[PDB]
Symmetry: C2
């Protein structure tokens, strides 16, 4: 590891416990910095180009210019840190505190402080401001969006007063305390999001006139460079139409629909418009419309200039432009879906140039000037290789790293007999081919994830293998980075294809002489917990033992914005929902299955596993259980040791 490796101006920078080291060598010490403070530490980089960061300290935030080596501003956000969103000007920060949105202005060293401005005053339990909405679907990670010159702050306003909440119970007080979680379930009334724009110069707020239906999803907010227009990708409840619309930032009025995308199954916008350098009129839009995620060049009237990238592979990260905006830089699966390389392509399209040719996983940062890249590489044979490259040519290696369980990899055919699936197999520690071994299928299988890549490597497979158990994983159809067709086969039919493909994995395991076919188990979390449970109920003669963590059990109880994409609405798809409703098949549990839930899980509500145990009571079947009362969806931190030991012992006891 090379702590905090990143660009600052035209220098690449990393920490050495005490120093921050710059190269294009200069060195900046924690004591040098400490001397400059008002009253090597951790920081958040605000502006890589300018090397502007913020330092989290006792009594407030200190902005710091690492290139000038000078304090910029002190910020007082009343101890709020989670929702911090600094203006691109660097001298103001937005945050949410006790339900409301505020802007705090930075104070110059010893020039006194100003009281923060309240953008909103009526925030409440059912009226949420400046936070993520739509259950963080559609790439939404926050609810504040500064205009690029800092003149305005756009923000979400989510009225969830029509959403029927779920109790989230804190068991630690003397008497347990419940708080409502406004988690909108499939087929129910959604929340109503609108977008406000607060104009800093006048203190006026205008709301975008997004109109009806009020449930429409307002995603990928993207400001025009000149701050006159705020663009929004609006998605309908069916999730088969996305309209990219322009709104006037001064009045909130609708201006025009630039373009509309539609899909047989679903459209899923995940990334904002990105304007070309120096341009207010041209932008890149990511779209999976042709079956593969690609980069499209548009003007602001909505006219498509050209598809810039194309091929039966997907762009997985858009990194930006050359200064002239004549080239695009991005990460993609072009080399292989099991790999990630960094590429250059002419804005006019045509041939990609792979800038990180070595076979495996590259994670790459383009410098602020667009002239160089930091590259961090790993492969099954290479633990870590850190390169810095002046784009054509001159690569400089900065770092290279050099009984454990054997990992085997390969391909099997999916249940269609045509589609190749990639698998990884962690062999028992000290594996002996003369011996028979139990094996656990570790499954996820849900959209957006891909578990099998050409990496060096959260190590539960290795722990299990150390206890003498092989662990097998296969990326079944439904999984990611293989194009839309490979994913969308699951539409309206969750579990069906996924399980058919996982059984192809089992066919492969049973073809291995060293596999004890009577000692096959299964483990997964979330979609993986749904899959674990579904496989035990559906293939109960095969799967002897399973452990299902935070499992989805009834998709009618999953959040609207995720579940209705892949499954449609419960009213539109009773047959598909019914087939995946594991409560209806609890009587088919004939093996040993432990369900595990964090009690305060806001992703898969606790009710899922509790109702399964309830269904098993009625059906006279006999699962086991563990609850982590202090944890949300996943068990995080040191308690993860307890989790691994609980899961592992369940398998060593019963499988």
């Amino acid at each position: 590891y090379v702590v905090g490796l990143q660009w600052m101006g035209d220098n690449y920078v990393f920490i050495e416990g005490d120093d921050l080291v710059f190269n294009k060598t200069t060195r900046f010490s924690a004591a040098d910095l400490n001397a400059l403070m008002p009253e090597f530490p951790s920081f958040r980089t605000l502006d890589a180009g300018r090397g502007l960061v913020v330092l989290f300290t006792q009594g407030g935030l200190v902005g710091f210019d690492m290139l000038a080596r000078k304090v910029t501003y002190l910020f007082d956000t009343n101890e709020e840190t989670a929702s911090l969103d600094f203006s691109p000007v660097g001298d103001r920060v937005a945050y949410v505190r006790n339900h409301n949105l505020y802007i705090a202005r930075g104070g110059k060293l010893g020039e006194g402080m100003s009281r923060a401005i309240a953008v909103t005053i009526d925030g409440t339990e059912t009226l949420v401001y400046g936070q993520a909405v739509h259950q963080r679907e559609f790439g939404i990670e926050k609810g504040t969006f500064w205009s690029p010159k800092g003149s305005c702050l756009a923000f979400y306003r989510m009225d969830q007063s029509m959403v029927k909440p779920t109790p989230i119970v804190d068991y630690h007080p003397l008497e347990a305390e419940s708080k409502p979680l406004y988690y909108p379930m499939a087929g129910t009334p959604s929340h109503h999001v609108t977008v406000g724009i607060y104009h800093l110069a006048t203190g006026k707020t205008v709301y975008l006139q997004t109109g009806e239906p009020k449930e429409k999803f307002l995603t990928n907010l993207s400001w025009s460079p000149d701050e006159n227009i705020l663009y929004v990708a609006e998605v309908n409840r069916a999730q088969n139409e996305c309209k990219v619309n322009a709104y006037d930032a001064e009045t909130g009025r609708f201006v025009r629909t630039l373009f509309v995308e539609t899909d047989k199954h679903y459209v899923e916008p995940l990334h904002p418009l990105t304007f070309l350098p120096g341009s207010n009129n041209q932008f890149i839009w990511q779209s999976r419309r042709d079956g593969w995620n690609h980069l499209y060049l548009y003007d602001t009237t909505g006219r498509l200039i050209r598809q810039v990238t194309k091929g039966e592979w997907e762009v997985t990260n858009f990194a930006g432009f050359d200064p002239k905006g004549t080239r695009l830089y991005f990460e993609s699966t072009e080399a292989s879906p099991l790999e990630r390389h960094f590429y250059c392509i002419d804005i006019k399209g045509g041939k990609t140039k792979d800038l990180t040719p070595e076979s495996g996983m590259h994670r790459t940062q383009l410098s602020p000037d667009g002239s160089a890249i930091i590259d961090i590489f790993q492969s099954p044979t290479v633990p870590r290789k850190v390169t810095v490259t002046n784009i054509g040519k001159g690569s400089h290696t900065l770092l290279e790293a050099k009984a454990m369980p054997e990992i085997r990899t390969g391909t099997i055919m999916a249940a269609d007999g045509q589609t190749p699936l990639y698998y990884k197999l962690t062999m028992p520690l000290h594996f002996d081919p003369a011996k028979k071994y139990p094996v656990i299928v570790y499954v996820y299988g849900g959209p957006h994830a891909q578990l099998v890549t050409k990496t060096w490597r959260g190590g539960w497979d290795i722990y299990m293998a150390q206890k003498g158990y092989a662990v097998f994983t296969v990326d079944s159809r439904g999984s990611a980075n293989r194009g839309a067709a490979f994913e969308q086969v699951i539409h309206r039919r969750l579990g069906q294809t996924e399980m058919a493909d996982q059984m192809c994995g089992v066919d492969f395991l049973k073809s291995q002489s060293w596999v004890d076919a009577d000692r096959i188990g299964v483990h997964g979390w979330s979609y993986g917990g749904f899959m674990t449970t579904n496989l035990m109920l559906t293939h109960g003669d095969v799967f002897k033992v399973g452990v299902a963590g935070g499992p989805v059990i009834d998709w009618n109880r999953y959040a609207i914005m995720y579940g209705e994409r892949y499954f449609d609405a419960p009213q539109e798809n009773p047959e598909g929902y019914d087939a995946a409703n594991l409560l209806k098949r609890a009587g088919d549990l004939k093996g040993r299955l432990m369900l595990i839930h964090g009690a305060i899980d806001p992703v898969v509500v606790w009710q899922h596993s509790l109702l399964f145990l309830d269904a098993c009571v009625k059906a006279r079947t006999y699962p086991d259980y563990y609850v982590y009362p202090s944890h949300e969806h996943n068990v995080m931190g040191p308690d993860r040791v307890h989790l691994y030991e609980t899961i592992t012992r369940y398998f060593t006891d019963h499988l």
Copy 2:
């Protein structure tokens, strides 16, 4: 079984599927009865003397005179059945519906109906009328108390707005729904109960002027025969003082304190004043003041005439008087604490006469005229023997009943080396003395219960024994029907003596050659779940495997009215509470323990077991779990099969 065996007038009565049979023989058929209905079934007897019952039917209640064979009244209680309390006059019924107390008047066959009267109108979530209060401690089972001539209805009013509630979550709706349970925990603010009296003739309500502290416990409401005075046994928060006070029923004014009882540890009134036949001036009061529950004769000024019963044994049921009120009839432990016999004693005291001399458990009903008794008897050798006796002499036997696991019984010394404890031991099915067997201690050990009596017989011990496991139970000190000294040793020190005595049980088991000393387990529910868990943590080298159902884990989270009696308040007793707080010792769990909870348990809140699992996470120890989301404190009905199989398999898997 002889279905519904009871007195009606001077006849004893029982059902024969179709007939109701009377003897002093007459027979009354379901078709005879059905012909008399407006528009053999189940009924509730209202007045045994008059043979007046009520029949629960589609569309309302039908009162019926079984001696006259005539319908009395039809009652419309808007489908409320749980809270029904019929006037002793027989023609009105009180009940609680949607928070409020009502009186419905019976309607004579085809004479039309009248609308019920609302006694209260402001009942609410935090203001409870006509229901049990004080967590059903102090013998409180209901919240309505008719005056003996039906002129007035006294009732509880419980303001619980100062009690911090616990969430009880219903998981069955689409989104789970929480309702607050106003369960007042040890050391916290209690609810405020007052007593209203509704006068039927005037429609006026007066409240007793019970005064301060408002938290005082108002128990064992008892009307004077002439309806002028309502007596109340008031208990202080410390539970070491009980004042029996007279209040004027017309005005609610305090009249006088008749007598006060105090105790080093606690006083616990459990039974109402019972007036002598034909007397407004003399009554029997039950009291454990001398160390043993006995019957005391008082006048209404509060002057004690005499202790009527005395001895180192306890009255366990007061059955009533001879018509003249010169004799008392009651059940007691005089023969043996392992037995129950029915006795006569002169009101002047002196020598008891045992009316049911045969060694074992007699359950006896004195006839309305006090001249005869129905007796139902069982012993280890006698399954069921049903006698009817004209009191001296002439006993008439009405019924007598005649590989399973062997049950052994005996005595061991408690940890004091002095006090005898009685045990029962269910031997493995097909027990072989040459063999070694695992054994499970089934423990309760809490106050008010006594698990080892001289009976024929809920059969979990037998099921376990059928799986090859011996089950042992011993009534340790703290348990019931052995006098106050035997019970009160636990005061301020819950678990300590109880466990010392249970370990004497283990010493005894280890002295048996056929006991595998390395395969000892433990199971119990409620106080028994606390004891199971405490024994595993305290004696982890002995108890390999346990299953603890609805367990108390932190006594600070038990209800005030029970916990503060035995433990004092948390602020008064940090050392004792701390020693019993199983959350503090979760790191001592080194065996296999499954905790089981009903999610909607209003007795031991679910939080107890959840916090233990939480404590085990932090302590890195590894319990197992099951939750019955649809069940309260105990699993009832068919689902009890699932429970037994879950508990049994835990032991057959791990012990």
